[PDB]
Subunit: 615 residues, 3 copies
């Protein structure tokens, strides 16, 4: 079927005819395909060769790993070989045949063939079963949790719930509102965990969990607001009003408070209620205003209320229900419990082997010694099973969030890729936290064009050549700015002085590799003053005092003065150049402070001449 | 009353564009259904079982089973039963160990030893074979791609080609020059993707692809420039001329324009021609002037021209040929075709599942939009197979790059660790971009000695016992500098103020862990001026008006305040300034006036103990 | 009305309505055809008959039916004909069944049952053992190296030994003290490799190795000082003395100088003496002062001294011993030696393929062109066997530290998570070092509130509306500072003037997403100078002069003077505004620097009025 496409929208004739032509071709194609189907199903001569057909030995059930299936060609070859063997085979002594067969592979002798066969089959069975178990098992108590990433936030309130979106790959969190009536906020986050937007839903409770439903490639939330279930989507807006949208309240649990929760794919939903009973339900039957109960379990009181072991974390799978325990401090030691829908407990795990800032273990080890779990989520994606556990780490009014996950053996490889997608990849400072050191033998400051930090030794500073004069002798600090599109860079120079002054010199360097040319910008000098003045060396400036080309600075002390050509003065004063014009004329001025002889001299020191000093 | 209405044609563009898109979708549906049926009829391995097939009996077989229609499973079972039951008539079955030997593992009553043996052996064989094949599966339509890295660039044009050297692990990429004659650049990059150097080859065409050849542990590239293949090595040099170089053209394709491409080892070189035919050749033959053509591939026109779907990059393997497709927006949906050297098309892939910045999936979440599928390179190394797909993301003159890979189960570890080699390992700020908070129980400013940014809350802002009194009373910030070789640091302090002004202090710190000792340097202060100057407080400064230790403040204004301090009856708040700190406790203080109504300049040298009086 | 083509409204709608129904019909057709195909492939009962299927004959089959390709029906007919005419034998014993069972899976006929039974089991067992070997195989000459992390340090002396805690997962390394009588320092580190604290052990030798022991959940170190062993713990204290504590130094080893080393568990330690012989001892034995020697390993003298191939690090395992070689340059080629406790040399390894900053292996691609092997540590945890090799890179007084690893299949996942725990997650810049580019279609400056750097192009400046005047028409840069607890940010603006000045501005922004309200702070302008004053423009300022409102801009220009209130100076008088009061009032000063005419004019510029220009 070859359609036209690329139809011209301008010409009135071409488009109008092309539509009819394309529909005619499609209608022809459909009939052709249907006829080919019907011919294949009934009387085509060479429909299939034998190698494609799979023959089942014994029915049992189609177990994934213990197939009893053979290809028909191979079966027929076996049949022919068996018959031919019966035709052509010389029978011999019975006892000799039985005796030799009794020896097993290792070499011991067994009286009955039954024993030998059983031993061999048992050995191979165990050897296979071990690998099969390691391949697909998912056993929570034997798995180390790992660190995946952290989530952003708006304010200083701890999070309570989070979940993953299967279409966008975005993640959402809930934060408890501080208003009189307890509402909750909702946040959009990028797959790696950066902040985009917010909703505010007042009177929504403290937000333990919500419900998720996917319709037409879009998500919709379920939340009990003012005794109304309310189905709604996400907008970057403010406030939702329940009266606008019809409620789907089931009649049985209308009086008592409940909170909905949904599994990863969004097909089944459960309501947790005040008396501590969770019950499984179906969204579609909920849509059709039908009440249905499938299974329920009950939870003891020592894990509900905050004063014994607070209530944190709920999760749902296809055949299990997950629950988590209280404060998670050194007391009440936050744990997780796994149930089955028949109402049975299976396993329990203590949360003590996690990775913190200063070594794996408990609170002690990390931040402000306060740490506490907040939420649970379980997703099974792309054939792998991962359980996510949330934690909130920090202090009071200094709170941060983290997420940990238990894995099977594929695990987070994809999650590691997602995190790598949004991290820094250029090394600004070395991993230990130090700064880069200069390569051996740098001569001009324009040779070093790299992004990052750079610290140089006083000894090689000495090597350095074309550098400004006020920078001699002492160690230098070089911190290049990030960059331009053409790999142009800004360079910042600072001097290391405990006592004296820190000066900054800034330029732009144009490396000009491809088509642009080499270039060095004009220096810039920032202004600052410390608890010590700058001291002059007359020999440095050749005793002219108008060789002070550099931009504004300050000076102090008497005899340095005595060497000068300006007024003999018997006390020293600063050289400050107020301004520049076009031809290099700088507007020099010096001052005297106290009224012994109070004088401020100023003249236009052009490149060649100096006008008379006066006041 | 209601006259008829007419509208311009230009209002109709969106509808016609939707029509074109929908026609494209319908054609795609036919294409994929036709392909799956053709695969089902000839090459699929598990088409049907033996329960779905019916058999008709002829006259001879009708004498034995008396029926006319049986399914194949039942008929084969009956024949096996007859063959096995024919044997027992030949033997005396009074042996008991064989009778016990006839039951399988699951508890089945067999007829002879054959049934048990065959069933148990096939049961073990199937499980073991599937566990084998789990590790050797490499099928593109079932592999999700992961991100690998970003590549550098020198100008504001998109790249075209890239490849990995098998010796150094370096990356070489090509960009198209903007010269009237089409020339292309070559960039040598680090194993992670940072810039090292450049070569310029003008008048070399658009540079869609290039070839690779190894001589004595050196890399050589072949490029058809001005009718010459040219074999040469890379340098940090400009300009390559055909005159210095010997040509290796076969006469067959001498008039036609073409570009070469090589496999990861580089032993085989393939040509792509303007006719759209891709052919295989061997490098040894070309070097020794031998012409050999093994297989050819011919590709339709709708993937070649820029008016249907443009060309972007190719790559070849030992048994497969890889071709790539056009624009890659919401329309033209960049795709990958996998081929065979017999001239058969195998599979197709649509690139919509990728991981972009603001989300998973397609252009919407991508950026300024405009991802443009741009490259291909296939290499298997160290027993693992992987294929790389390039992209170009951004807008005009704002362009970035990314690399994606489809890998076997387990082939990426080395590449991820190579990237981890040259990344940042020390956290300057927290993950979400927030700044580190101060630890609980801080009293000394020289105790926050840790690399990174820091924000300090106002409530405890002043619980600090060390801090200039100017900084007092409002929230504060802290910005440490990276480090010194002896773990020494620079410390920077800034103030959080909305309407006054921002200050800045800097000093040196020596922690003194091994041999050096605790040391603190002097403060350094810049200057900052805004629409509201700082307010002097009489009570804070003990009224001396000479207690002001801090440098360069410009800290003044206000009537009132003047009366309390020494200088008498100002009737206006003149502003303090320090011209210079003559060393050792000596400062050049100047107080002054704006405008006249009386204009004067109070200046005096404030000694350590005493002050000389003012004069104008 | 030459342009435009017009269409009736009513007719045109009919076209769209016609097309849409056609599209819906086509989609329904696809749905039905796909459904029938899916039903055919899996569950249909009567897909084909036996006529349509073609069967190919093998080599064995061709000798029976003489054909090459037959239909399934005809082949089945031939089989049913042959089976009936089969006859068989008549022997009394079982024999016949054994004869029948001789056929193997591949259609070969074996003489006796033993041959088949051997062959089938061999065929299965080879493949089974291949898979079981692939997992627990640890063949170091075939394992490849990977980078894992860096380590911190104090001063410019290379590190010699390092080891890992098995409880808190911390890192310890030792640097050699540079005093006359050799000592060594001990550094405690974070799980990722960042610095915490230090001790000094004076006069302790070179500190090449040390012994580790765990008691009652506590860590103790054993080091040979002054012919004394002494067991001591780690404390935030300096200097260790053997005088106070009891020593465990054995009777036999009094004269020779020996250095202990411990395995990962710490149950066994061995002594490397100056003679080069290593003996195994049990830690529990020394705790009860019992002298025992298990095994000894002889080292060639050639790997001992400095002149031929220096000694770098050792490691012991529960079954094997490991050894390294000298300098590791292009000469002395660092190598690894594997030894067994029977005293046997096994394998040789060359370290040439490591990952360097600009290379996949060699030295030439390294650093300052220098790196040398530095240590070893063999440990297995959680069942995975991993060997770690350290390296130190750099030159004189410029030293770096790196760690490389050899791992079993699927081992490093935990260590990768450990490193990612303290890594960088927020993307500040691109990987190549570029800066973020401004979003397309930006209007106001305050809208761009995202952490990181930002470079702009002049064109964006052109549209941009909320920027101060002097900043016109130039490339501009935006550099945000990290964040605030309520997601508030700082902003810095720098002009890109190569010739002129790097003008800097600063303000603060409150987004007010959750509760607050959007608000922008005042500009603060830092003051700096270069080699060229700015030239003012009269048209821009509406020719007021006392309308300039910016903070210490310096201005000049002979020509514009006439266009301002100040009269007939005929030379470029300078501009500086000294200060701002409380009520917006500012002080303006215009100055001459020349004395050929020298003057200072300062006038109060209020909000509405101005005073006289005085002097």
């Amino acid at each position: 079927v070859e359609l036209d496409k690329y139809l011209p929208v301008n010409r009135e004739e071409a488009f109008r005819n092309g539509v009819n032509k394309n529909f005619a071709k499609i209608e022809q194609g459909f009939s052709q395909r249907d006829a080919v189907m019907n011919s294949h199903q009934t009387t085509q001569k060479n429909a299939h060769d034998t190698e494609q057909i799979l023959h089942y030995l014994s029915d049992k059930e189609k177990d994934v790993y213990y197939h009893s299936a053979l290809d028909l060609k191979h079966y027929l070859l076996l049949e022919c070989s068996r018959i031919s063997n019966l035709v052509l085979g010389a029978t011999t002594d019975q006892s000799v045949e039985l005796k030799e067969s009794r020896v097993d592979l290792e070499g011991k002798a067994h009286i009955t063939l039954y024993g030998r066969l059983l031993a061999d089959f048992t050995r191979l069975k165990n050897a296979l079963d071990k690998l099969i178990e390691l391949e697909e098992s998912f056993d929570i108590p034997k798995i180390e949790p790992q660190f995946w990433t952290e989530l952003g936030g708006i304010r200083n309130v701890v999070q309570q719930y989070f979940w993953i979106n299967k279409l966008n790959g975005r993640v959402y969190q809930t934060q408890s509102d501080s208003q009189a009536q307890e509402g909750f906020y909702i946040n959009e986050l990028t797959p790696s965990g950066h902040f985009l937007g917010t909703m505010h839903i007042p009177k929504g409770g403290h937000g333990t969990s919500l419900g998720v439903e996917y319709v037409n490639g879009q998500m919709f939330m379920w939340t009990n607001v003012d005794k109304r279930l309310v189905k709604f989507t996400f907008k970057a807006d403010t406030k939702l009003d329940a009266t606008l949208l019809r409620d789907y309240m089931p009649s049985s649990v209308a009086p008592v408070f409940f909170a909905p929760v949904s599994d990863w794919k969004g097909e089944k939903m459960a309501f947790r209620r005040s008396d501590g009973i969770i019950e499984l339900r179906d969204v579609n039957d909920l849509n059709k205003n039908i009440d249905k109960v499938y299974a329920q379990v009950t939870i003891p009181l020592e894990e509900r209320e905050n004063d014994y072991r607070p209530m944190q974390g709920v999760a749902i799978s296809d055949k299990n229900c997950y629950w988590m325990s209280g404060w998670g401090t050194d007391e009440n030691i936050g744990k997780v419990f796994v149930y089955d829908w028949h109402g049975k407990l299976l396993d329990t795990i203590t949360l003590d082997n996690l990775t913190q800032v200063t070594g794996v273990g408990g609170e002690e080890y990390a931040s402000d010694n306060h740490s506490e779990p907040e939420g649970l989520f379980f997703t099974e994606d792309k054939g792998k099973k991962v359980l996510f556990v949330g934690f909130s780490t920090g202090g009071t009014r200094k709170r941060h969030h983290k997420i940990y996950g238990f894995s099977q053996r594929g695990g987070l490889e994809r999650y590691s890729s997602i995190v790598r997608n949004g991290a820094q990849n250029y090394p600004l400072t070395r991993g230990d936290g130090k700064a880069h050191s200069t390569p051996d033998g740098l001569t001009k400051l324009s040779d070093l064009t790299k992004v990052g930090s750079y610290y140089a030794q006083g000894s090689d500073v000495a090597l350095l050549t074309d550098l400004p004069v006020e920078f001699k002798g002492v160690p230098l600090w070089i911190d290049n700015l990030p960059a331009e599109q053409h790999n142009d860079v800004r360079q910042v120079i600072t001097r290391r002085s405990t006592e004296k002054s820190m000066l900054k010199f800034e330029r732009m360097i144009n490396i000009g590799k491809a088509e642009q040319a080499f270039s060095v910008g004009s220096w810039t000098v920032y202004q600052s003053q410390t608890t010590r003045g700058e001291f002059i060396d007359a020999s440095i400036y050749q005793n002219k005092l108008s060789n002070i080309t550099s931009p504004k600075m300050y000076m102090t002390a008497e005899n340095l003065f005595t060497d000068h050509p300006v007024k003999n003065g018997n006390a020293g004063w600063f050289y400050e150049n107020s301004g520049y014009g076009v031809t290099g004329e700088f507007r020099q001025t010096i001052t005297i402070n106290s009224s012994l002889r109070y004088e401020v001299y100023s003249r236009m020191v052009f490149a060649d001449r100096v006008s008379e000093w006066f006041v």
